[PDB]
Amino acid sequence: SKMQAFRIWDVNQKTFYLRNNQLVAGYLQGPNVNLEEKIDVVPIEPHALFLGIHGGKMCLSCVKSGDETRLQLEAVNITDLSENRKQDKRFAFIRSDSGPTTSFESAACPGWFLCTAMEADQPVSLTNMPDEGVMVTKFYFQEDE
Amino acid sequence: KMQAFRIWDVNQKTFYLRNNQLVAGYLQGPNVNLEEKIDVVPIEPHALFLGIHGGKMCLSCVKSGDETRLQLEAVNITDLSENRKQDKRFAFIRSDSGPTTSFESAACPGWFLCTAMEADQPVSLTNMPDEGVMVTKFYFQEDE
């Protein structure tokens, strides 16, 4: 259970980058390629994990705002989280591989998978309609190391 | 470099923009001026980039599982690169059959550029070009 660095891009080749402290998927080229966000990962045996950016300084979570289930980026240290604390569960994600791609399902909001839009520069989100082909839910997740 | 062509399908439909969505229909009267010529930057062997407006807008295929989508992105066709991972979505493979031509998505293999049998529908992509529902055969005339 320690911090690993991963590079991620969806099946349409979009990368993650921040815009107004929001995570968005898009195509970075040239000087802007330096905006690419690597994903910091702390494994939770056997198939879950905590996901973050900026050296695990900000972590991804699933939050329910009234009637909405939205992805959120919180200012918490990936290292303070615990697979055994009820409150940190909103940060857990289940990793599932199939072929050369990877999917991430929310542990606190099951049935919700991390996703990106087909159009560029849209924020990264969570959809509960994976196979219904509107949002992308498959990613190439590789250990940047 | 950029080569220009005129395109029209086997049913005589031409491409034109409608609410900035590439649609295919029959232009009449002063509307014939709405025809969109296709700009091409070939990629040896038989691959190529396709655009309109002097290469200022290029078509691409983006997928989501078992479904694909045809998009017109505001990118310069000259900035696209064949040795660039992300630009593959703009690549198309050309094939000719007799006097006709077909275009297959490199990013979404098995999906061909196609038109609806009826007029004024958006140009799209189809995974089944054989079972004739959508039209996938085109006349592609090099504007020389």
Swiss-Prot record, chain B:
Keyword field contains Hydrolase: no
Annotated disulfide bonds: C58-C108
Expression sites by tissue: The intracellular form of IL1RN is predominantly expressed in epithelial cells.
Positions bearing carbohydrate: N76
GO molecular function, one term: interleukin-1 type II receptor antagonist activity
A GO cellular component entry from the record: extracellular space
Record key words, sorted: Cytoplasm, Disulfide bond, Glycoprotein, Pharmaceutical, Secreted, Signal
GO biological process terms on file: acute-phase response; immune response; inflammatory response; insulin secretion; lipid metabolic process; negative regulation of heterotypic cell-cell adhesion; negative regulation of interleukin-1-mediated signaling pathway; response to glucocorticoid
Described purpose of this protein according to its UniProt entry: Anti-inflammatory antagonist of interleukin-1 family of proinflammatory cytokines such as interleukin-1beta/IL1B and interleukin-1alpha/IL1A. Protects from immune dysregulation and uncontrolled systemic inflammation triggered by IL1 for a range of innate stimulatory agents such as pathogens.
Disease: Microvascular complications of diabetes 4: Pathological conditions that develop in numerous tissues and organs as a consequence of diabetes mellitus. They include diabetic retinopathy, diabetic nephropathy leading to end-stage renal disease, and diabetic neuropathy. Diabetic retinopathy remains the major cause of new-onset blindness among diabetic adults. It is characterized by vascular permeability and increased tissue ischemia and angiogenesis.
Family recorded in the similarity comment: Belongs to the IL-1 family.
Protein name as it appears in the record: Interleukin-1 receptor antagonist protein
Species of origin: Homo sapiens
